[PDB]
From Swiss-Prot, chains A, C, E, G:
This is Protocatechuate 3,4-dioxygenase beta chain. It comes from Acinetobacter baylyi (strain ATCC 33305 / BD413 / ADP1). Plays an essential role in the utilization of numerous aromatic and hydroaromatic compounds via the beta-ketoadipate pathway. The gene is pcaH. Coiled coil: none annotated. Fe cation binds at Y106, Y145, H158, H160. Binds Fe(3+) ion per subunit. Keywords: Aromatic hydrocarbons catabolism, Dioxygenase, Iron, Metal-binding, Oxidoreductase.
Curated annotation (Swiss-Prot), chains B, D, F, H:
InterPro entries: Intradiol_dOase_C, Intradiol_dOase_core, Intradiol_RC_Dioxygenase, Protocat_dOase_a. NCBIfam families: protocat_alph. Pfam families: Dioxygenase_C. GO terms for biological process: beta-ketoadipate pathway. Plays an essential role in the utilization of numerous aromatic and hydroaromatic compounds via the beta-ketoadipate pathway. Belongs to the intradiol ring-cleavage dioxygenase family. It catalyses: 3,4-dihydroxybenzoate + O2 = 3-carboxy-cis,cis-muconate + 2 H(+). One of its GO terms (molecular function) is ferric iron binding. 3,4-dihydroxybenzoate binds at R135. This is Protocatechuate 3,4-dioxygenase alpha chain. Its EC number is 1.13.11.3. Binds Fe(3+) ion per subunit. Pathway: Aromatic compound metabolism; beta-ketoadipate pathway; 3-carboxy-cis,cis-muconate from 3,4-dihydroxybenzoate: step 1/1.
Length: 238, 202, 238, 202, 238, 202, 238, 202
């Protein structure tokens, strides 16, 4: 199999850069259209991260920052599969996540909300997907976060994530929400995505059969990245 | 077939998950950073630095940047590179940094890349691929950094030549300077306005 | 106006005593039918509690147990109206509430779940409704609680409440849930209630216009008690 | 018209909100309890005590109980009482207690109530109204406590006489005992089984 | 009752500033997003106008400008209630209205339409709402007005209005239309409002039971302003 | 719950209903105007004047402006003011004016306001609240006017400090001038473009 | 992969123990609720049966009891897959089946129905599923069976089956029916199952493409057992 | 995800498919039975016997029983056992029997099991897992058999201690007897009524 280029990004499946309802995008969006290019080796390659460097608790947000005790909040496991748009598993991709604590408070110098900080929660983790494209991490369900877009803006509970996989073209950062949160229908950042079906693609589902008795609930969330086409005739990449 | 998961802004606390030390979070033993030069890394050492400006001409003090590039011989340290050449073994090819919260300056310590094959037998001029993430930015913005001392190769580069508004090509050329013996390339990015940096859909 | 008896309790609007899906009800439910009686003064009177005895933080679960700092979790206000079945406001009724903390952990000697205890949260409060039947309290949204009915049973997030009002016949204890929690459809205690419309009567609604910017969300929850009929002919109570 | 909010069990941690001291929670200055006798309260002091048994004959060690009763002259301390009589002013008429977590015993320190008017000119025998809440119990169970030394009034009581299965009337009669000068009424409640206590829908 | 801030303005319930179909908005709309602030005393106070200064015909557009006779046109009464978003009446609010005459002609130096001027009609009035939030005025139904947006633009018949009430944050100017006017579906100013339900909120309804025989028809039109939340815990306004 | 009635532009004839004298309509005995100073009004008299400019840099010759402000001691003449202080009794606190149809100049004769309490114990710098209505403007635009001679209080003002792009704060500062003994503050408003005035959602 | 416990049995997907329409369940059902326990090694292990002990005709009910000739009746093949609830194949599970003959008569000392016995049919078989979880056996389609629940009770044609697989917790006995039998809607044993979708899960489907010309028809029937969750954090089993 | 296939009673002819010899069907060469002791099997031989009683106190004469247990050292002969110990190689760990059609007695010839690890580092007391199938029983009933001569281990067993109604724990303890040199444990099961045997949902 000789791989050709990644399939084109479908711009209609993503938010536009300019979205006036999300106020900070007004001065941080280009006025010019993006210039599309044909892919080269630069766009189809990406770095490799070895599992060797990762600590044992890197995917355990419940324990990786715990000092005197356990963090306060809802114990949950999140797992799923990362696949490309042709359904092939994405192997050894780097997944990085970050989130607020159970109060909706972020451990960051620029976050000053009155929701309490948790001395035993950090809010960041990472993992590499396995050969089936599978990932799993454990954490505290974050609380909804108030912010100033309009003065009384509230985002639904969410976990931010980032993926670095096989090709630079696949580079992606997004966030997922939890099934049933009523704030999902009011979030102006979620509303930058044009279609309802793509908005639903960011919702992690309750996975009741995988709950662990007297311990933790579980959410199922799959991620889809751009995929490469196979070449059977001329190979123009190089 | 499946649709790509839609992008969402990284937001202002993107440092928590991607540069924890900058958010004052010590959790990992090995932290990804902005230094691509290891002791045995081959090539000429260079520093890449600049600021990112919004539409009012002000610096983004919460922007996160990543670069991806080839080694000194123009080979990518990735299994997807098909040149059949041995890559420098002491080179990751990638780094991540964040602008300083007070000044907005960002920088990387890296190596100047060698030329990489372009499509259909062409040769691309040396370049670094760069992506920008920040609050207000809904989808990471891709751009490329070329070097002003590679005038000859730049003039023949396939990607630069595919930008039909020729006055915009110069926004992708970084300026060489020499700070006390070090080679520094200054590359400022202007997201909106006059001299807006070219951004690509790759 | 001369008051007669309370309207009969509609047994079809409540759970039966024997509900085998809720296991502990099997040995704690009478085998005999309840004996209905005609009401007397004993059933239509009830005690009076004076506001004088209540502390200033009795309806503030966020601060009434706080020692070194604030409790960890989602800051929420819950408010509503208590009315009788004829729509008249219930004045000066005693409302007592209790709940688990943000981890789904109760501050009780018999609760041993691994979800962390919060040194600054107690989990109980009380208040008297005003002359319009209105009540308001503030708290931390509780986390869903695991328990052993079947081994992997999980109840949705909820706040328990109790009402002592004008007549002993009105005496009531129940609990409310929060709009959108996906566990509501699986709870075997909620399923003891026969009809869907009565199950929905225990769900507190998101009250977005009453959210307080950069501070707290808000839920709206109204309670209905049995009501007395007015008498215009013979008064048989005495 | 509106439907009554449906009942749900109080569950095993009902002490947190209703008897916090029993859950070891000190939050309130004034705590509601099981002592209905104040220093100037009129009437004969009595202790009411017993256990609540489940269908296996075992005591509920997590049950919460409340009682509502009239004063020594048969007047309720409630604005809904229509007798036109002055009620004892130092009497709440209500108390709450929980069974001991180890033994299941519960008790109240109270006063023996006077007779209260029944419907249509009748007179009810002295009684205390009692309600039970606990895990496993979906709706509080109402019952009444009568006194064995009021044989005469009990035989003529309208409510006891409205129970058509006459052998069941005795389950509502508490037994008088005299512990070291104190008058104690023992009332055990049997939720299921032989000698099941009568429960009312009031 | 201690009042806190007004509820946030819901920007999705109003027209955007930039609406290219309404041509003059293109150079008169900010390019930057509005900066939301938390309210202070400046935003929750407003002036008080005394009824003493108002003339007896100030709410009678049929007679307040009449010199030699009555104005030509359809005699109509318009009345309604002004309430806040929580349904509370808005007491003693200043309502000012202005409109074109029966020809669709405005009494203004910059209006040069051929539709005839009426020597007995002025086109402006004002009134204070009463304690129930009620207002009533009488006028001539205005005729539809031609203007140059596209060259053949016609607005439906309408009356412009302005409200100054309890808090500066409530400050509002809008206009209402009359039920059934076919031009309502083509008006580019009405189309700047995003949702259909908000567009319908500007339509005054025929109120047949209040018509006055052989005299005047009647329209019913209610106005809703932003409302203040009540505070039960910390009062941060000051 | 109800939704707020949606806003619509006041249009070019907004003078008919709000400033009839400017449209040459004499109908009212008492006309609301731009003079907030009554004979016994306390404080230093000042004139506030400027023009409103559109995106081409041209003045709006049909704009209507209103201001709301506190008295000389920082108390609002409104029942909603909670300071427990007596307000100047000869001060409405509000005025309305329209730009001249030929030049676009507008002005108000008013008093310089005293400092008003901000949230959580803070103190706001002296300011006037101002709203703009005109054809082309779909929702009145709110802004604030601060004074350049109150540098000290401006630097500590909560609202000005909540504008994160600091170069924009200066658009809300009016310039003090002294025309033949009168104190004049010039405040020009730029709706679009370079130096666009900050507008608030209040 | 480190296996944790089996997912909880969903009691709502199975018949209750007490089902008065199936008369013999009235004195053979516990009055107490089942006591749920957390699983240990005892619940997750099970025996292993070697194929070596099985005879060549053990899954051929048409020939395994045939003496003088072939049994009378409809020649059918039944095949399918046994999977766990997560869709993984159940390998080397012991499947045992038993049924009545073509007359609806069982070869058992306690069956005295007048439907004729078949000297060449026994009515029992067994097999081990293969590595894909596949099973196949051949038999005579049983006839519907009359019995005394109500006096004129008739069960639809069915084959009883039993599974012993990987964990004791998976232990299961049930029965399947054949598509289209009209008695399926009247069977009181089938009606003990609460939901319609679970009742349909016991119906074997006609598999026309697998019929063998001039020989045998074929039915397709898949079985689902409880499945084990995988563990990625603490392993509490031991 | 899939739902578990629903259970259905085995019915009265369950012997045909599971104990054919009892239905007088000779079809298999190797028949599964109730003898778990092979010649080289390690451990102390014991006989387990009893009857199963319905709600009228009568024996089920059509019940089928199976047991699953560990070897003498507490290791299960299953690939799912994770102890890392060698199991007795001459031990299946499972057996099946049916009650006698006339008397209802059932029995197994087996070995007394060794203690097996419980969860989180605990140790379970020796036990045999047992399941019951019969006409009238819609889902096989799981229970456990403990031994009265293991008082010490029984008192500390995690499962027995998780039954909160303590009087019910004794129904799971079989009685040791010694019939002519053989060790016999009698375990009667009472499906309904007084002294109803504890059944588990495993
Ligand atoms: Fe976030
Ligand atoms: Fe609870
Ligand atoms: Fe108009
Ligand atoms: Fe059968």
């Amino acid at each position: 199999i000789i791989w050709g280029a990644y399939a084109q990004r479908n711009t209609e499946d993503h938010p536009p850069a300019y979205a006036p309802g999300y106020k900070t995008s007004v001065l941080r969006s280009p006025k010019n259209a993006l210039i599309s290019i044909a892919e080269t080796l630069s766009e189809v390659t990406a770095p490799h991260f070895s599992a060797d460097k990762f600590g044992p608790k890197d995917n355990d947000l419940i324990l990786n920052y715990a000092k005197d005790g356990l963090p306060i909040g809802e114990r949950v496991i999140v797992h799923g599969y990362v696949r490309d748009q042709f359904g092939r598993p994405v192997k050894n991709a780097l997944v990085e996540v970050w989130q607020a604590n159970a109060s909706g408070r972020y451990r960051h110098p620029n976050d000053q909300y009155i929701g309490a900080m948790d001395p035993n929660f950090g809010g960041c983790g990472r993992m590499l997907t396995d050969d089936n494209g599978y990932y799993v991490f454990r954490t505290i369900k974050p609380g909804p976060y108030p912010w100033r877009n309009r003065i009384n803006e509230w985002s639904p509970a969410h976990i931010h994530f980032s993926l670095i996989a096989d090709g630079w073209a696949q580079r992606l950062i997004s966030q997922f929400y939890f099934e049933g949160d009523t704030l999902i229908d009011s979030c102006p950042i979620l509303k930058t995505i044009p279609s309802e079906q793509q908005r639903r693609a960011l919702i992690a589902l309750e996975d009741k059969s995988n709950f662990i008795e007297a311990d933790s609930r579980c959410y199922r969330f799959d991620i889809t990245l751009r995929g490469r086409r196979a070449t059977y005739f001329e190979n123009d990449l190089t | 077939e499946l649709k790509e998961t839609p992008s969402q802004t990284g937001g202002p606390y993107v440092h928590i998950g991607l540069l924890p030390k900058q958010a004052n979070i010590e959790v990992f033993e090995h932290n990804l950073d902005n230094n691509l030069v290891q002791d045995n890394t081959q090539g000429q050492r260079i520093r890449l630095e600049g600021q990112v400006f919004d539409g009012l001409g002000l610096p983004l003090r919460d922007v996160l940047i990543e670069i991806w590039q080839a080694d000194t011989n123009g080979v990518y340290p990735s299994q997807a590179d098909t040149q059949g050449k041995q890559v420098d073994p002491n080179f990751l090819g990638w780094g991540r940094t964040g602008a300083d919260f007070g000044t907005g300056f960002w920088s990387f310590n890296t190596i100047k890349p060698g030329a990489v094959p372009g499509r259909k037998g062409s040769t691309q001029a040396p370049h670094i691929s760069l992506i920008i993430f920040a609050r207000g930015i809904n989808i990471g913005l891709h751009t490329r950094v070329y070097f002003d001392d590679e005038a000859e190769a730049n003039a023949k580069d396939p990607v630069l030549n595919s930008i039909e508004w020729a006055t915009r090509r110069q926004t992708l050329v970084a300026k060489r300077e020499e700070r006390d013996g070090e080679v520094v390339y200054r590359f400022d990015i202007r997201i909106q306005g006059e001299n807006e940096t070219v951004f690509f859909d790759i």
